[PDB]
């Protein structure tokens, strides 16, 4: 310490010891003349708090760590962002899925059903867990109707579904059949139901995440997931309830009768129905199988061998909104000694790293009431909407909406990194950069904030 | 170490090493005699917590830090504010808008339009995040009334309106058509959506970012958006649905009847309303063109050419009701060494800043089951609010409410600054003095309290 | 310090005193060629921020921290999970159960009563507290079909139960039943009820914990609780309603009249309901006692003979979602010195650990409103969920939900472990891993980040 | 430092610094060898982590802190607990009430009331702020039946109840009567209601905190309210709505008619209700006067004499499910030096004390819709619950749901004790145990887990 202190500024006098330098954006004479074509992740300031002079004129002024010394600064943070759940930054308003795009009796009488990949893109804003999901079956029938349909294509075969419930729980061990016929509409997980000849990918979105369907492994680039792997697991078809109703007119311990009344002349049961009002096809594998052609992820994660069906490539997951915590990178390149292996440099894409931190997004979690609710309006028939174009399907239908619903939340994130080494010259400009994963700026950031406390740490 | 501790006071003592003074407002004693005329976000304190001596008397005393060492106290201190969400200060009650203000038959047969931009503010208080909208579109209707209507102005051409939904959800690509003749009332985001001739501007207010519209480079004194800028995506006009339903008089795998049941005699389609119950007009650019002249945002934003649209100046992101996490600085002139590059003064408005904080805002989200529960009773006929005065109109209506709405709330912040240098001649009275990022009290300041623990540093 | 300090790189330059290093996984290059075949519970990193090095010629290069010196670093991390509720892993979606799964009426006259253990699995997923008691209830049906039935089990008789409800308050103590009929439906607590001949087993599952139901002295291995066990607190039987209502045909201060009033020709009481609508057998023990043979175990806890019932060896407490908060332990073999009684392997199921730390989760609660309006639909007769096969039980019924249930909920953890003693000569590749207190990766790891701060501690 | 660092360990090499202790319990090895009679509040773990000793082998060797320094070491821990509400532990399960046990018309026509106090337990749970108060109330009632009823005691003068309302809001000044004839049951703070001759004892329950009836000098062992001193503040009578009914046929500013319209024959006022529906006695001191014989806490409290009344020796204040934030005391006899003035011993229930802190437990807040719900479904005849077995009796009714409720709720509290003074040779293995306020082990422990971070502080 000794003569080590002195902190020194041009003429003001000398201040010895640790004191504070600020860097701060919405400083007003900043502003206009230094950062006015950049933005609040990548910013010029003067830190030079001194009311007398020119800003560019600051820019020549110093603020000198005395030289005797090696100096260090305690760099607390304020960051603060407002970044949307869906958006074209962060991939989550992408994914593309192949589905059925044509249908027409080739030539012979052979028919010929040709699908393509598509990819398909949400608007941005800010969405629930469900709401999303929502989106995204509607940014499916939105591409069925630009070409779906005005080609031979059927509702009753469009491809993919983003549903959420345990397709087979009414299942009957021995009929098999979903005995009450309609598959009990309650919400177990975001799942995936496929058709023949088509699949979604996710290669390039974090949607996937939103889903909760991550890879057992990662690191391989790539997500393809199609028909062919969702193996065993297919959505068994609904028990035929009128046909059944319709028909039948042609220990002695108190468990003597109970015994008698629970026990050629067939009845109606085998009759898996086939369609649904308005007549949708449920496309059954044969006239026989119970099953229909309709296969679920969810189905085959739990449901079909775990040593070979997706249960083993992939991964079952809670869904997080937010897609993923990604990290954020500070860099104060004109201010702090660049960190062990990092290179110096003047590519904003590269500056050194003093910090990390995760971007400022929660996950809120409320309840659903709405559940429900919603079970008791279109049992008493009215309008519909883009999300429910096939009320009558018990499939194409509109996923319960799940009770717990989650939202992707911004929150100011009064953060502190440790204590770091600087220069001991420090310009009367400084430079500040957050970058993101990818290394990049990042639009969503409303305010950056920062406060250093230099202080001596050793001598030379 | 050593010598260097003593911590004197008149006669009372020694005292050595680290101890306490404290900086408090509600020091009754004080209140009376010296800050009278001024509030919590600048006052006068008596440091001297000695029950003999009279304010003035103590205002001469000193505490005295040994003169032989640099010394340095922490910081610890509690603010607790109570600023409401809208208010005159905070520019959260002002906002430009552009309106029609008069129409009259030209003088030979043609027709004059004039247009002005206008202020309108709203009732100082804590809002949501919607009824804020809500009162802002009452606003805008309030003026109507003052001027529109009186010279020619019919509600059928009110030229600005903030919603918040995603008006083309029904639109079908062939028919160019909101098909279910209705906008799917859902919530997605604030929205604006302008009349030709008009528009809007936020230059002067921070109301821009609880609508969640943000420049994408910010630093650009100004923030006007007119029709002229939300340019392709204007709200498609809905199909008549009357017109429609009144007309119609005059492979082999099952999927058999399905590809025949769903394939000079034209139909009603092509009639897209006009007007709604009280005729009111919808404005549509031709007799022809399916599209009406109303414009908005989010669609611009989302649907129109990326790279020339809004899309490209601007930036969608959320809400946030507090209207911006904004910082304050705290500054104690009479006892701690004025850091770095500060000018020592005595302007209020200019004192050195020894630290800096998040003024005391946050927002509090909850889910809203008010959500359709009003659907099911305007659907019921009765009165009205001074809010939905176009029921019938599907676009002056009255946004839907989204579920999740946010709500700003204060909270006590006990924050922590460093570790400062101190004089070592404290005087018997100290000024504290909060300030905000323009440098000016806060008059919404309910409480700051500051604990101070000097203790030894270095030595002279 | 002096000569101490320097922490040196290739040509890079001298650096002085701490700095950072930091160990991340989602950076991009080494993904590719590194931990392909990883996942983020156990990856390589290059600490080597360098952008000019290939991954692989970096891991030769390295940082050196000054050989004169015993050096020391701060760890801090950002660890974030997804795990859900129930999975197979947490051993949350298995669990023993004895039920009965044969019933004939045997050679002489005599019956044949035989019963089995079995293990139940549930669809992996994260859920309520409530919906995973049904899911389990639901289970225990869905083997009574593929099995009980078709071989005389009446449902009359299935074996093991998870309610909520506390059966006993409408109780009389003179007749010796539940008076008002039906046992009121109010949650208290998760439970077990039995019948005789059977239990449940949860030897191998911490669903225990999301019931509640713990061991007295948990390091027992071991956990059946069968039907001797609840001994003393049999659902008593509820009153016959109607044989009771159908009958009855054949001081002096105000307090006159109320002595009266409230004051060979026997009547209906004595008559304790038997069976139910469909006619279920309550299977009472005698044609006389009022107790059913049905057991609970909150009943046996709370009313029978706390010195001898279950209450002694169990304890009864809090739910917990999460099924038991558990830790896990970073390793940093490749950078960090080996914590004192460690022995240094290449196992990675037994590196060093150098932190500890709990699990990212959590549980949420929210306010069940869901509670009674299921109250009123029911009664409205309508169909039924896989869930209420017996609504017409009393006792198969549906487990009341209880207000306030609670969710597993996944959160990001920025978790701060001391400063460690670490080596002098940093590989340019650095192996991170997370384990679990059984040892072993743990797949529902999205991201683990590490920084860490080296810094002089003593010298050599 | 220089020689004083050495952390030595077998044969397995020289540590330097500062390091990692870990004392766990779910330690695999330990559980089956050591700690198999024991809890989780009081068990043994081995410290020595080294894969190849045995646990016994291990109990031998020792970490041994160089003997030239005194060391010290940071005790961090994680407690997590799941205790519940009410219990038998933290007595929140009984509570001494005296209530009518007897009523027969003594031997000449005087007549005889005797009282008695007796012990009420609960079924152990957790609960609710209210349903907790039910389930007291309700347990007066079971006693009831079991005694009272069967010995001439009318529910009319069932002797104590905790409701929860103003029993005076509707009150008139003049007519000395609740005029709205019904106590408006709205909830605001738990009360006691007594009838003469009997009160309610708490000198042994927490439960007493949970009503939020404090005595204003807690130091005094003893917590009897009884009639006698609830004085002043007697429940008024509701008055006769029919009656009154039944009864009636035999400046000029505007402010005329209003004047003359506001303004021997006497009416049916006079007449306070007596009974109610099946005519229950309300109690009435006289047939004259117009406040039932029924006395309030709440009542007293706040209506009553200040300077005499209960409003002297009582406290009014706010609930806490958790009946009393209660602190644990952890203590590691085997491995840190005994603090200040504690003894050393082998007493499980007097060991050293090294750091205190507050049982895992706080309150959550819930907003209750179920408020009114309930007043418009017992408007609407149906059963009844054991809670409300007097419907229409205005008082022995059912407490009004408060909005708002409270729940105990346990939460995992990652702690951290200061820096301790440890001894130099460290057992291989160390003790660890909780202990409650009263020294104690505490059953509801789920996991405690402790880090020490061992560090040279001064020297030999
Ligand atoms: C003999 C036919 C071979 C076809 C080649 C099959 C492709 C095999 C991929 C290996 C992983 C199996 N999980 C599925 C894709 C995962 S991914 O998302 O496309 O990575
Ligand atoms: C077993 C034969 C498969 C050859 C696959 C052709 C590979 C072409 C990949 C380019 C994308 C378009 N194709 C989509 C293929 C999807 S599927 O997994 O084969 O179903
Ligand atoms: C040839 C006609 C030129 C008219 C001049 C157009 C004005 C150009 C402004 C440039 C930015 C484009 N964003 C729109 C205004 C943004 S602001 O809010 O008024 O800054
Ligand atoms: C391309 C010709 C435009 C000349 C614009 C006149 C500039 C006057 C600005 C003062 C404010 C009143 N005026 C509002 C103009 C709004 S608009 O963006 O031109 O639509
Ligand atoms: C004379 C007949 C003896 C049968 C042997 C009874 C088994 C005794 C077990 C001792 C504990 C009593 N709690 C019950 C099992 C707990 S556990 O979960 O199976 O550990
Ligand atoms: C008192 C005689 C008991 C002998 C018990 C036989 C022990 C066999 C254990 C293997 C599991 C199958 N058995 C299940 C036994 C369950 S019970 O606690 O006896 O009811
Ligand atoms: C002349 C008759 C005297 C009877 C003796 C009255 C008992 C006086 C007790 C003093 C406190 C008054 N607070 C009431 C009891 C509080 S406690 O809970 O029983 O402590
Ligand atoms: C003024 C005469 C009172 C004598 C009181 C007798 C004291 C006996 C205490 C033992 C408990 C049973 N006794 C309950 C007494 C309750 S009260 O406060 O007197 O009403």
């Known amino acids: 310490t000794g003569g080590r202190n002195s902190i020194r500024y041009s003429e003001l006098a000398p201040l010895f010891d640790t004191t504070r330098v600020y860097l701060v954006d919405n400083k007003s004479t900043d502003v206009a003349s230094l950062n006015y074509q950049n933005d609040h992740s990548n910013f010029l300031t003067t830190v030079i708090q001194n009311n007398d002079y020119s800003p560019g004129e600051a820019s020549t002024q110093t603020i000198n760590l005395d030289d005797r010394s090696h100096w260090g600064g305690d760099l607390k943070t304020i960051l603060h962002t407002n970044m949307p759940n869906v958006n074209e930054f962060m991939f989550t308003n992408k994914f593309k899925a192949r589905v059925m795009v044509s249908r027409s009796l080739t030539k012979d009488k052979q028919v010929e059903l040709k699908y393509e990949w598509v990819e398909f893109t949400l608007p941005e804003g800010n969405y629930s867990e469900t709401m999303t999901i929502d989106l995204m079956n509607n940014a499916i029938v939105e591409h069925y109707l630009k070409v779906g ?43 995936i139901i496929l058709l023949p000849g088509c699949g979604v990918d996710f290669t390039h979105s974090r949607l996937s995440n939103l889903l909760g369907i991550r890879k057992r492994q990662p690191f391989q680039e790539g997500f393809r997931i199609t028909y062919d792997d969702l193996e065993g697991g297919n959505i068994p078809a609904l028990l035929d309830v009128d046909a059944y109703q319709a028909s039948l007119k042609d220990f002695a311990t108190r468990a003597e009768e109970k015994r008698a009344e629970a026990e050629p002349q067939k009845k109606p049961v085998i009759k898996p129905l086939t369609e649904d009002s308005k007549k949708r096809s449920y496309n059954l594998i044969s006239n026989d199988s119970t099953f229909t052609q309709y296969r679920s992820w969810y189905l085959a994660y739990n449901y ?136 990049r700026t990042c639009p969503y950031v409303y305010k950056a904030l920062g406060i250093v406390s230099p202080r001596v740490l050793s001598s030379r």
């Open 149 to 191: 349909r005005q080609n031979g294509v059927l509702e009753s075969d469009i491809g993919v579904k983003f549903d959420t419930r345990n397709f087979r729980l009414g299942f009957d061990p021995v009929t098999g059949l979903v005995m009450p016929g309609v598959y009990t509409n309650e919400a177990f997980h975001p799942d």
């Open 304 to 439: 079909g061998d775990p040593q070979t069906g997706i249960r083993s490539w992939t991964l079952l997951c809670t869904p997080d909104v937010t897609c993923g915590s990604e990290q954020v990178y500070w860099s104060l390149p004109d201010m702090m000694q660049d960190p062990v292996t990092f290179r110096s440099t003047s590519q904003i894409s590269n500056f050194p790293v003093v910090g990390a931190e995760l971007l400022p997004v929660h996950s809120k979690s409320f309840y659903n009431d709405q559940a429900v609710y919603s079970q008791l309006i279109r049992q008493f028939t009215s309008l519909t909407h883009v999300f429910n174009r096939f009320p009558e399907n018990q499939i194409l239908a509109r996923p319960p909406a799940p009770t717990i619903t989650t939202v992707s939340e911004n929150v100011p994130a009064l953060t502190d990194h440790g204590t770091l080494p600087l220069r001991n010259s420090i310009g009367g400009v400084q430079r500040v950069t957050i970058t993101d994963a990818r290394r």
